[PDB]
Amino acid sequence: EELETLWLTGICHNSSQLDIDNMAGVFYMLAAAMALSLITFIW
Amino acid sequence: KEIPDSFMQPFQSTLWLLVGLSVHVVAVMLYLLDRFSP
């Protein structure tokens, strides 16, 4: 392990346009708004 | 080191314009329901 620490050593690891999945929820809420608007419009 | 705003112009202009067109269509539809009230 000491020699691998000497040689094989890296770094351990784990935007304004990150809402690519929020816009799907925007589309679902728009579809729900259109459906409820049709429900309120037919009566 | 110490190398330094994403508010509107460095912020994305695609989905913001989508929200603007969406509230435009919502305003048109709500005024259309306001005019045609059964």
DSSP chain B: ------SSSSS-SHHHHHHHHHHHHHHHHHHHHHHS--
Q: Which residue of A has its CA nearest to B25?
A: A30
**Is there a contact between A16 and B12 (Cβ–Cβ < 8 Å)?**
yes
Resolution in Å equals 7.0
Token pair belonging to B12:
């994305």
Method: cryo-EM
From CA B32, how far away is CA B38, in angstroms rounded? 12
Which residues of B touch chain A, with CB atoms under 8 Å apart?
Answer: 6, 10-12, 14-15, 18-19, 22, 26, 29, 33
CA distance B21 to A4: 58
